[PDB]
Each structure stands twice: as C-alpha cells, then as structure tokens.
Amino acid sequence: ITKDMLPGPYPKTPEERAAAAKKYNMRVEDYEPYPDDGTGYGDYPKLPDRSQQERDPWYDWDHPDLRLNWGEPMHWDLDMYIRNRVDTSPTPVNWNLMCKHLFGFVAFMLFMFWVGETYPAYQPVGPKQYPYNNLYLERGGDPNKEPEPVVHYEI
Amino acid sequence: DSWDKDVYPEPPRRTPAPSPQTSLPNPITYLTKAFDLLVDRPVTLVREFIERQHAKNKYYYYHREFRRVPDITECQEKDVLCMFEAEMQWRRDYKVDQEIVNIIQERLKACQQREGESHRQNCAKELEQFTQVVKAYQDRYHDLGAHYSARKCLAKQKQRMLAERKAAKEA
Amino acid sequence: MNMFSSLSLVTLLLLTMPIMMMSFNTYKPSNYPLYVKTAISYAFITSMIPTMMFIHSGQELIISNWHWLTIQTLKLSLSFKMDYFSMMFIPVALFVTWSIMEFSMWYMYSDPNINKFFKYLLLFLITMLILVTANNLFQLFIGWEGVGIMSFLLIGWWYGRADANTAALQAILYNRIGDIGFILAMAWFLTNLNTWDLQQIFMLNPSDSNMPLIGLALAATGKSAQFGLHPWLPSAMEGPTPVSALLHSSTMVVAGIFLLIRFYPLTENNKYIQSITLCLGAITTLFTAMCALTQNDIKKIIAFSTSSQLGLMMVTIGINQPYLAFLHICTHAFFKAMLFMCSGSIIHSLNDEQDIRKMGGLFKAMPFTTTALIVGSLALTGMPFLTGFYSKDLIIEAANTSYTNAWALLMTLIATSFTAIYSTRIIFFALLGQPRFPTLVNINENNPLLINSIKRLLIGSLFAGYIISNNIPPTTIPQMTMPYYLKTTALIVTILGFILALEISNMTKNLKYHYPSNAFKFSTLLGYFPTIMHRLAPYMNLSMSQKSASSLLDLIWLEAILPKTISLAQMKASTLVTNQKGLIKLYFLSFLITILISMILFNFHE
Amino acid sequence: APPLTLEGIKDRVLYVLKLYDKIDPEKLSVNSHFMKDLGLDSLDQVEIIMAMEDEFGFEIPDIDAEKLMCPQEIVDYIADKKDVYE
Amino acid sequence: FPKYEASRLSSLPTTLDPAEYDISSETRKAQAERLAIRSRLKREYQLQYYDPSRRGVIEDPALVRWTYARSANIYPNFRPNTKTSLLGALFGIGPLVFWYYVFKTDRDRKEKLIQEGKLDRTFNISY
Amino acid sequence: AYLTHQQKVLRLYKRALRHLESWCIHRDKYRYFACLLRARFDEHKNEKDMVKATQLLREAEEEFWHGQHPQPYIFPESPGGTSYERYECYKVPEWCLDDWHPSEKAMYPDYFAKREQWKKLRRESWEREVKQLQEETPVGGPRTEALPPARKQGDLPPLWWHIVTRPRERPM
Amino acid sequence: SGYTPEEKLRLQQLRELRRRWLKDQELSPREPVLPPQYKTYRHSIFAFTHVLIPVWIIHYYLKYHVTTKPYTIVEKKPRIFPGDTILETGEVIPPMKEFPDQHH
Ligand SMILES: CCCCCCCCCCCCO[C@@H]1O[C@H](CO)[C@@H](O[C@H]2O[C@H](CO)[C@@H](O)[C@H](O)[C@H]2O)[C@H](O)[C@H]1O
Ligand SMILES: CCCCCCCCCCCCO[C@@H]1O[C@H](CO)[C@@H](O[C@H]2O[C@H](CO)[C@@H](O)[C@H](O)[C@H]2O)[C@H](O)[C@H]1O
Ligand SMILES: CCCCCCCCCCCCO[C@@H]1O[C@H](CO)[C@@H](O[C@H]2O[C@H](CO)[C@@H](O)[C@H](O)[C@H]2O)[C@H](O)[C@H]1O
Ligand SMILES: CCCCCCCCCCCCO[C@@H]1O[C@H](CO)[C@@H](O[C@H]2O[C@H](CO)[C@@H](O)[C@H](O)[C@H]2O)[C@H](O)[C@H]1O
Ligand SMILES: CCCCCCCCCCCCO[C@@H]1O[C@H](CO)[C@@H](O[C@H]2O[C@H](CO)[C@@H](O)[C@H](O)[C@H]2O)[C@H](O)[C@H]1O
DSSP, rough: OGGGSSSSSSSOOOHHHHHHHHHOOOOOOOOOOOOOBBBBBBTTTTOOOGGGGSSSSSSOOSSSEEEEETTTTOOOTGGSSSSSOOOOHHHHOOOHHHHHHHHHHHHHHHHHHHHHHHHHBOOOOOOOOOOOHHTTTTOOOOOTOOOOOOOOOOO | SSSSSSSSOOOOOOBBOOOOOOSSSHHHHHHHHHIIIIIIIIHHHHHHHHHHHHHOOOOOOOOOOOOOOOGGGGGTOOHHHHHHHHHHHHHHHHHHHHHHHHHHHHHHHHHHHHHGGGHHHTTTHHHHHHHHHHHHHHHHHTOOTOOOOOHHHHHHHHHHHHHHHHHHHHO | OOHHHHOOOOOOHHHHHHHHHHTOOSSSSGGHHHHHHHHHHHHHHHHHHHHHHHHHHOOOOOEEEEEEEEEEEEEEEEEEEESHHHHHHHHHHHHHHHHHHHHHHTTTTTOOHHHHHHHHHHHHHHHHHHHHBBHHHHHHHHHHHHHHHHHHHHHHHHTTTTHHHHHHHHHHHHHHHHHHHHHHHHHHHHHSOOOOBHHHHHHHHOOHHHHHHHHHHHHHHHHOOOOOSHHHHHHGSSSSSSHHHHHHHHHHHHHHHHHHHTHHHHTTTTTHHHHHHHHHHHHHHHHHHHHHHTBBHHHHHHHHHHHHHHHHHHHHHHOOHHHHHHHHHHHHHHHHHHHEEEHHHHHHHSSSSSSSGOOOTTTTTHHHHHHHHHHHHHHHHTTTTTTHHHHHHHHHHSSSSSSBBBHHHHHHHHHHHHHHHHHHIIIIIISSSOOOOOSOOOOOOOOOHHHHEEEEHHHHHHHHHHHTTTTTTTOOOHHHOOOOHHHHHHHHHHHHHHHHHHHHHHHSSSOOOOOOHHHHHHHHHGGHHHHHHHHHHHHHHHHHHIIIIIIIIIIIHHHIIIIIHHHHHHHHHHHHHHHOOOHHHHHHHHHHHHHHHHHTTTTTTO | OOOOOHHHHHHHHHHHHOOOSSOOOSSSSTTOOOTTTOOOOOOOOHHHHHHHHHTTTOOOOOOHEEEEOOOHHHHHHHHTTTOOOO | OOOOOEEEEEOOOOOOOOOOSOOOOHHHHHHHHHHHHHHHHHHHHHHHTTTOOOOOOOOOOOHHHHHHHHTTTTGGGGGHHHHHHHHIIIIIHHHHHHHHHHHHHHHHHHHHHHHHOOOOOOOOOOO | OOOOOHHHHHHHHHHHHHHHHHOOOOOHHHHHHHHHHHHHHHHTTTOOOOOHHHHHHHHHHHHHHHHHHOOOOOOOSSSSSSSTTGGGGGGGGGGGGGGGGGHHHHTHHHHHHHHHHHHHHHHHHHHHHHHHHHHHHHHHSSSSSOOOOOSSSOOOOOSHHHHHHHHSOOOO | OOOOHHHHHHHHHHHHHHHHHHTTTTTOSSSSSOOOOOOHHOOOOOOOIIHHHHHHHHHIIIIIITTTTTTTTTOOOOOOTTTTTTTTTOOOOOOOOOOOOOOO
C-alpha cells in the first residue's frame, strides 16, 4: 500500500483524528488512539481488549477461524487474542470469587497436610527387627569392624 | 573366547539343576528345543559357512605401539619441538586413562546386575576399585578446562604436591 | 540367555517393521491397519516367552548391544533392561494395544487417513517400549519425549479444529514444564555419580538424593498429570477415542509413575521424598475425583477417573510400595482401556454424542457394551476378585497400616468413595432410564471388530489381576495383620459411595428446582484452575513478550542507546563542519586563531 | 449415518408438527404459514424450531430460526445445511 | 443476585450491560453507519473474492497496517520520558543485575567450599 | 444493540429453555418446568408500556445469569461442541482441482467434463452479476450485507459461486 | 418476521444451483478409470517374514557380535536354594537346618 495508508504519528488535531479514523475504516466517533505516552503506538486505533473467542460464531466471517472480516482494523494484540490463546469471555462465576475459592481450597489443603505430618498415623507396633546385628553386613557395613552388637529377644 | 577374562572378570557360573516338582510339562523346555532346531541350527550353519570363507583369506592387523618420549617436565620452556612431543604423549595418555575409568565403571555395572538383590554386599570390591580409580583420575585431570594441556596438568600437580608438603610440615 | 535375549529383541524389532515398510514403500496399503494389528498380536506372543522365563526362575538380563557414543568417561550404549518391570508391562501393554487397534479398525473406518492413524499409534507404542526398557537416562529421555510428541500429534488429530490444537499444545506445555525436572535429574546424576546408567546410580546409592528425586518427582508430576500440572489430561479428550484409550491405559500417563518406580532404590531411603509424593498423590486423587462428580462429557468423566487413579499410584509411591504401584499400572490398563472403548461404542452409535444427559435407555439396546461397561465399572471400584481388586485393595490396606500423613490417608479414603459415585453416574445416566437421544435410532454394536476387541479386554478385566498376582514373585513383606476396620475400609467406603450416589442420582427425577450451590460450581468448573491459570498465565507472558521484550527493549531502547544515538551525533557534527559561508575572510581569520592557540596554549613552538 | 432425502426430511418435519397440540393435523400442509394459517405466535415458533433441532440433532442459529415460518422453509433450511439434493 | 463484577479476563455479558438496552435514535444511528462500513468493505472483498479470473492473494490493507504498526512504526513514535526510561531501566537492566548477584553469590559460596575441602566431589569427574 | 425488543425476549426464551433442559435432564421433568416457564412469559405478553416491558426483560436476564447451568448442553457440531470444526481438515477448496496432474484428471473424465461446464457458466455470468450489483447499489456503497436475486431469465444471483460450490459438510 | 420476497427468491435460486452442484459430484459408473495394474498360508508367511527371519538375524547378531564383547549381555545370576545341585560342578547345596515345624 501507499505511504498515505500506513500507520502514522499520534493525531494532534481533529482533522488528523478524522483522517486516521478514515484510514482505519472506522467512524471518527469510534476511533480512539492509544495514549500518547511515547510507547510507540502512534495513531493505531485502540480497540476493545476482547478475545476473538468472544465474537459471534454464526456470522459469516471472511476468516471464520480468526472471526475477522477483510479490511476491518485488527486489534494491536490480535495474535494474543486468537482462539488458541487468551480468552476473555464472561464466566459463570465472578473472577474475584473464583480466585478466592481456588486459593482458599489450596491454602487449606496445604495447611491440613502440615497438620497431618505433625500428627502422623501409625499402628500400635514396635519396630521391625532384623537378624545378624540388624543386617549390618548385608547393608554394606564394613566387614573389618565388629559392629555394635544388636540383640533382639523373644516375647 | 574373544576378550581377556582378566581385564573383564566374571565369577564362575553356578546354575542349579532342574528339579521339577510338578507332573505338568514345562513349556520353556519345549520352546528351548524348538529354538535350537529352528533358530540356532540354521544360524550356526550360515556362520560356519562364513568362517570357511574367512579362513581362505587370513590377514592381520596390529595394535600401534607408541615409544615413550620425554615428558613436559623435561622440556625447556618455550621449546616447541620438545613441548609438542610431550604434549602429544600427554594427550594419548589422557585418552587411555579415560578408557581405564570406563573399564572399571563397566566392571562395577556388570557386578550390580549380576548380583541381583545381594549387590550391596557382593560388589564391595568393585565399588572400592571404582572409588580409587576415580580419585586418581580426578587428581590428574579434573578442573583443567577445555584448553587443557600437559603444562596445566603439571601446574595442578605442583599445587597439589605443595599442599601435601605443607600438611606434612604441620605434623 | 540366547532365547531370552533373542526373543525380547524381536518384540521391539517386530513393531518397527510396519514403520519401516510404510516409510520405505514396500507395503500393500490395501489393509495396512490389519497389518499393523497383526504385527502387534505377534509381538504379544513373542513377548510372553521372555516373561514365562522370568516367571519360572526370575531370569533377568541387561543387553548393551550397540556402543553409540563415549564422552570422555561417560560411555553411552543402546541398552535394554529386561527385568521384572519390563517383562510384565510389555505383554500387558501389547495385549491392551492389540484390542485398541482392532477396535480402531471399526471406529476409524470412515477416516480418510486411517493408515496414518495406525502408523501414529504404532509410533506411540514404540516410544513407550523404548521408555520402559531404557537402561540409561538418555535412552529413557528419548522415549520420554517420544510419547510426548506422539501425544501432541494424536490429540490434535482433527487439526482443523482450534480446540484440538489448543489441547495438543497444552499437553506439550505441561509436559515440558515437567521435563525441567527430568533434565535436572540427569544433570545431578552426571555431576555427582558420573553416570546416566541405572546400575551405577543404584550401586553408588547417593545419600543426599533430595535434588535428583525432586527433579524426578517434577517430571512425574507432568507426565502423570498430578495436581499443579494436571489440566492437560482432561483436555486430551479432544483426540479420537482410540487415542484416549491408549494414552490413558498404557503409554503416556503411566510413564510418570513408572519413572518413580524405576528409581525406588533411591526413594525407598529418602523419607522427605516419600512425604512429598504422598501429599501430591493425595490432593490429586481427591481433587480430580471431586471434579468427575459433576462432568457430563463421558470422555471427561473417564479422563478425570484416570487422573484420580494416577494420584492413587503416586500415594502408593509415597508409602514406599513401588511394586503395588506397578501392579496398579498393569491392572488399571485393562479396565480403563475397556471403559474408553465402551464409551466410544456409545458415542459412535449416537452420532458422536458425548453428553450423558442425551444418552439413557441403552442398557437393553446395547447389551454387550452394557456388560463391558458394568464389568469395567465394578473392576474400577475394587469389586472383590475382579482385576482392579488385586491392586487397589492391597494399596488401601497398606496405606492405613503405614506410618503416614493422616490427611493424605483420609483424603485417599474419601477419593475411593468418590470413585463409586462418578462410576454410578455413568451407569445411571448412560444405561438406565428412558432414552434421551434423537429420534432416528441407529444403535448397532454388532461388528465383530468391536465385539472381539472388547471381549478380550473383558476377559482381562475379570482374570488378569488374579493371574498376575499369582505369578509375580514376592518382593516385600505383605502386611496381612490388622484390625477388621482397617481390612474392610476400602470395601465399606465404596459401598457407601454407591448408596449415596444412587440417592443423589434418583433425586434428579423429582419435580423440584434447586439453585446451584457454590460447591457444585467449584466441582463443575474444575476448581476454576483452568479458568484462571489458562487465562492469567498466557496473558501475562504473552503481553510481556510484546510490550517489554519486543517493543520496549528490541525496537526502542537497544536501538536508542547505540545505533540511533551514535548516528545522530555524526549527523550533527557533519552539519557543524560543513555549514560554512565560503568566505575567504572567515577562513583566514580562523587560521590566525589556530596559530595563536598553537603557541599560547599548546607550546607547539617549543 | 443413513442419508437424508428431501422426502425423508419433509416427512419428519410434518411428523413433529402433527405431535404439537396447537396445530390441527388436518389443516396442516408444507405451505402452512405458522402465524397466518396455523394461528400460532412467536413464542410458539421458538418451540417449533427447538423441536426441529432436537429432531434432527443440530442447532439452528436464532437469526436463521426466526425466518422459518412454514414447514417447507424448515425442510429447505435443513436440506441446505445437510447437503441433501436427492 | 450478586452483581456481575467484570475483570480484564472475564468480560461483561451483553445481556447484563445497560448500554445494550434503553437505545436512543443516536445509538441506532451509530449502529447503522457501523453496519455501512462493514457492508462497504464486504462488497469490496466479495467483488474480488468472486472474480473468476483472479488467481492470487487479495491484499488486505488492514493486515498490512497491523504488521507495520507493530514493527516499523514504533520507533518513530517513541519518546524518551519518565515512563519509558523507568520501564526500560526496570526490564532491561533490572533482570541482568538480579541474575548476576544470584549466580555470583552462588558461585562464590561453591568456590569457598571447594578450597577448604567441604564440597563433596567424590565421583565428580565429568564437567 | 441491533436486536429489537422482540428478538431479545424470544432469544432469552430459547436460551432459558435450553439451560432449563440441562438442569432437568429427564424429559418429563423438563416438560413440566418448560410449561411453568412458558406461563411466566405469557403472563406479561401484553405489557404495553415499553418502559415496564424493558425492566421486565432486564430482571429476567439477571435471573437467567444467576440460574444458568455452569455446563450447559451443546449440540456436538455447534460452536463449543465436541464435534465443532471436526471436519474442517477434510474440506478442500474446489480450485485445488485445477492443479491436478493430467494423469489424475484422466481418472475422472466425466467429473471434469461437468466441472468445465460449471467453470464456463461462472465466466459467462460474471459480467452481468457485477453490472447488476453496480446498478442496484446506492451511491456510497451498500448499507447492508444483503444481496439481490437474479431479476431475469438466465441471470444467476450475484455472488453465488462460493455459496453453490462450497465443500460438503461431510466431505470425506 | 419471516423472509422477504427478495430474500426468498435469492434462496430459491441458490438452492437450485447448489443441488445441481451436489448432483454433479456423484461419480459415473466407470469412474475412477484406473490405469493398468487360506488363513493358514497367509498367517504362515507373516510368521516367516516377521518372526523367523528377524529372529534369525537377531540371534546371529547377538551370538557372533554382541556376546563376543565383554559385558554386553549381563544376566542376573540364578537363585540358588538349599538342596539345589549345581550343574557346572555337581556340588550339592546343603539343606537348611531343621525348623520347629510349627503349623497353624
Ligand atoms: C470432601 C472435600 C475435602 C476437602 C475440603 C476442602 C474445603 C476447602 C474450603 C475452602 C473455602 C475457601 O472459600 C471461601 O468461601 C467463602 C464463601 O464464598 C468466601 O467468602 C466470600 O463469600 C461471601 C460473599 O459471597 C462472603 O462471605 C465474603 O464477602 C466473600 O469473601 C471466602 O473468601 C473464601 O475464602
Ligand atoms: C532389518 C529387517 C529384518 C527383517 C526383514 C524381513 C523383510 C520381509 C518383508 C516382507 C513384506 C513386508 O511388507 C508387508 O508385509 C505384510 C505381511 O506379509 C503384507 O501385508 C499383507 O498381510 C497383512 C496382514 O497379514 C494385510 O493387512 C495386508 O492387506 C496384506 O497386504 C504386505 O503386502 C507386505 O508388503
Ligand atoms: C464394591 C461394589 C459394591 C456395589 C454396591 C452396589 C449398590 C448396592 C446397593 C445400593 C442401594 C440399593 O438401592 C436401594 O434400594 C432401592 C433400589 O432397589 C432404591 O429404591 C429406589 O427405587 C426407585 C428406582 O426405580 C427410585 O426412583 C426411588 O427413589 C427409590 O425408592 C432405594 O432408594 C435404595 O436405598
Ligand atoms: C553496538 C556496537 C556497534 C553499533 C554501531 C552502530 C552504528 C550505526 C549503524 C547503522 C548506521 C545507519 O545510519 C542511519 O541510521 C538511521 C537509523 O538508525 C537510518 O534512518 C532511519 O531511522 C531514522 C531514525 O530512526 C529516521 O530518521 C529515518 O527517517 C530513517 O531512514 C538511516 O537510514 C541510516 O542511514
Ligand atoms: C562503537 C563505534 C560505532 C561506529 C559506527 C559507525 C558510525 C557511522 C555513522 C553514520 C552517520 C550517518 O547517519 C545518519 O544518521 C541519522 C539519524 O538521525 C540519519 O537521519 C535520519 O534521522 C534523522 C532524525 O532521526 C532525520 O533528521 C533524517 O531526516 C533521517 O534521514 C541520517 O540519514 C544518517 O545519514
């Protein structure tokens, strides 16, 4: 395309806001640049931050997988909002409540595991006993030292 | 057979004799006989044929012997001609020492598998021999870096020898 | 040795021959699926001979045939460990794969790429057998990532579907996070033991094995889909049903548990690892079983059952019972693959309907599928003397008689009760009541491919557990003394789950509307973990990638501080030098200044 | 699945309407306009389309559904979506 | 009925948004001309998409603007100010200084232990 | 919003019925509660005050959101359903047949003879379709995405090729 | 609310074309025009070519290459139980000592 149709600097005047909106196939009322904070957006339109998953499935999109129409301005973050990536659709449960219940469940389970490690379950049984000085030789003990004798008795 | 039994030892094999305490036939026994007839026999004949061809063309190859040259200890500094030979020798001995540690590691791994659940006690000799050889290899070659050389190996040895002298001086 | 070693390699070589034929244009693609299925059946037969030799005398061996690479003092050879775990898993995996492949001939008949599908299934199997017989860690890694990639390719089978590609990439993402731990374990073993071989690792027996074992646990957390890295397994339901059956019984999901079993000589001495795995298993088994209580997709219910069963296996690892955990892998393969093939039979007959709310009244319409579903459900819930009972029951009574975390034990017991609840959900809503499916009835389970494949796994779900348990050598001390209430715990809580489940199910038929509770939504929406994590983490990472890494740094500040600043100064200096009036008077006046400062300031004349 | 036919689709569309108690089965034809002839309202029309979705097992989007006002239109819409040409 | 609390990643449903209802002739006018722009762009696309003799790619200026806006157009519109300099300093120098002290501190500890003989390296001969 | 008040109420009715059906499951229980729900809609059928009607619609939406099923039933081939876009990988555009090798085309001589007639019919109609669209479109482009029929004998409806020749719903 | 007459007419005309298009997708009787080109025996050549020939190759490979090198195939040594007779030497392994033969 020609240079007059490419993105430009932040629009300073209403005449430049009308040229930018026309360039991007938008209504001047709907056209809103990003704030002119020196971050490099220029006059590229600021579009609502919504996933493509949020668009009407039943409409005849020119790009059905992307749910875009040929010629419509694409969101700055279009590639992050494809249907394979970030979803922003409404949830049945409020976001803040969702976080509270997930975190609360996890924190409680972690707390209860610490308690269960403090008060372990076990059977009313004495230690298992092994012969030959507690299998000293079998477990790799040095054969050149006489081990501290371990004696197990009957009962 | 093919390899030296001394370099790669293997304890004597003790297979128990069959002592069937069941009237049933052993499926493995008849499978073994079928394997000998249908696999081992035809394979053996094909090999015996190939060995008849190799005996008609018998020729030899040799193991290269490397005469010893002076070490880097005997080289005057910046004397490249003597440094080169000592350096090449040191690199040959470095590769051989790597293979020595591999032989000792292969003994250790063979013992662990062979001894089964009794390996912790029946492989104590191989563990000890592996520990000693790895200690020696570490002293010679560890921490030299990618640009290792006989010169760097000597400096590492001298540093180690100096510390040993000082520790004795404490005694 | 000659027959044992020879036969245990033909099994692996036999499975690659269809791959070689396909890749080397020497096949009759008439019935390639039948060719692949036939080869698997023959591999199973040849794999039984080595297993029988192990059963007879415990004969095991290691084959290090091919020396691949020597890195200084680390020799790497292609090796195969033909031991207890290899000789019992392989025939089970082949037997289950034999049924899945025969089943898939009927189920994927209409697929234009069925030949490629059977090739991918065979590669999936070959990479799992590489994993299970690997003797060193590098060979294990080859199979570890091989099954991970085949999983990606099969889950995303229907690649025109955006959801299948998201689910496939999700599986890679979660398994790659787990693979960080695998790489960590390899690096620690190389550095501290100078080996990737399993024999040297066990001989040296490191005492401070916290770091290597934490890495191994992290790898198992991803592959076996334990809590934290769990959401990918239910999403893997995007794949064709034969993928789900094979990916859940053999191959992928069991590799994580198998890796910890292979390293039981280390874990059996490290208490701190046992506690971590126990708690990781207990939260997983409880959390996922809770999720299955309210799912309506039949594949997702069965998928969450696998997650809950894998969590149970991790608990078994956590109580120092690696051999019971292995037994559960083997028995689980039978009835879980059967359950997935039963759901596939229902889904196929109802025109790809997967919601249980649109099934019903299939008990009499699909008699053989019904029988297999009930047998598979009873085996899953530990019905006495079915295949499931011979692992699950011993695990529960070994867990309440151990020195163990009390919360983990209690959570594990509740999950056993939940197992009977979601199992009852499938039978009540799919088989019982009145039909809720569309009016054009097309039910038909009369294909011999469908019947025979399920029939073999049905015989397995009845007797396989009994056969295996009575043929495996003992390697522990089974703890057979305990109070009556610890002996029958699993049986009782299961029965209570069935009774409670039945009352809950029957109350759906009353004419009363009840607003959803908070706990109902928490279960239905999987604890909101996928809803939050799969939006928040991708958003933060993807926004940083563009805003900061790419825009702020690469396209601005790295340009600004070097090329843009340097070149701007040169331009300014050029205009100062060249912007002159061309006036003789000014140039010669500058000559006088130069001569003066040359003497007054710099003493160039001295 | 067993392939659909235009006569096959038409029969089932009429079959469902004959089981709707607000339509006289004797005054009903493929050309009967739901409002003008059969005297139904829009809330009724939503239920009719809902019943054809259940019948044939696929959803008709609301924008499409609101325009189907006679049984022939439903027959034509379904045959079009299922590639039925006879 | 607790009200819907919209988030960034959990948007507000239209059926609960007040702007959807209570429509004015001014809103219905905006929708009409929005639909006009879409209809005009659709006709321009269709006239090419349906052309029998066309073989190639229908060049889309909106796509070209997007890829250009997210590459070549960023520096011309960059301004060094308090926001960009603080962000550039934080995300550019910040992490590098952080990881330096992490690794330098860790490696200094390890070297100290190796000098004294307190670091276990019994079988460590691969590096 | 471009939906009339009628279209919003009718849409809310269908959506609430479907979610009600997901809660009820059993057909008899659904029929009982679908009639109670219909009675509620019929109770305000004749509300004339648009302001009161709109407020009723607002509350009904708020009630629907509170009581919706967290996991509603979706038809398998509907958006979000388990079979949605399952067959997109098998849909191949017709223009791919122009690249077939002649030895491939010789396998279907009858099919490609008909295909040529369709391509001939596309060329010979294109000019009239463009002209018809030009002469029926007000200055400043169309205001809607609707398209006209053909107005004459032999004229084809403008912009038909990709509707008529689109891939079959079950291509393979 | 239904279709407008223009809408209906356009749908009518597309429908004729679409159905004609779908009809033309049907294959003629001769198409495709291809160019020029019991269990026991079937199962026997599979066992021969996929089990016997491979095991022949593998046994040859293991017996004359892999096993001629040290430590390539390492077997766990057989378990020896009291009362066994060693085949290599004929040594008789002593029985275990007498139990208290207590039973219950
Ligand atoms: C058989 C299962 C075994 C494991 C059981 C584990 C139980 C775990 C329970 C964790 C509960 C955490 O979730 C907790 O719920 C309440 C109720 O919404 C939340 O509280 C929230 O709800 C209401 C408002 O709607 C208010 O009380 C409060 O303003 C709000 O914060 C808490 O912020 C949250 O922390
Ligand atoms: C290093 C490799 C060592 C082993 C080498 C052995 C090579 C012998 C290859 C023989 C043919 C292999 O390739 C293929 O085999 C199968 C089984 O016979 C044949 O397949 C045939 O039988 C199968 C099942 O019985 C049918 O599904 C198939 O319809 C039929 O064509 C193929 O027609 C043949 O092309
Ligand atoms: C290890 C495997 C253990 C498997 C255990 C299997 C289930 C064990 C029995 C569970 C309870 C049996 O069910 C018990 O008796 C009858 C069914 O016969 C039920 O009776 C029910 O019948 C009808 C069904 O037509 C219901 O609509 C009604 O609400 C209820 O009365 C009881 O509500 C229940 O208390
Ligand atoms: C970091 C170690 C080495 C760094 C050495 C870097 C030295 C500079 C190398 C590039 C020299 C290019 O010199 C010049 O740079 C500027 C931008 O940088 C380019 O100019 C371009 O960008 C500038 C400003 O961004 C615009 O005003 C101009 O419209 C555009 O054409 C010129 O086309 C090029 O001629
Ligand atoms: C570490 C040592 C590195 C040594 C690198 C070698 C230095 C080479 C210096 C090249 C100097 C000329 O580079 C010059 O840069 C300026 C950047 O403002 C460019 O100028 C460009 O940007 C400026 C403002 O941004 C505009 O006014 C101008 O219209 C535009 O062309 C010039 O087109 C280019 O000629």
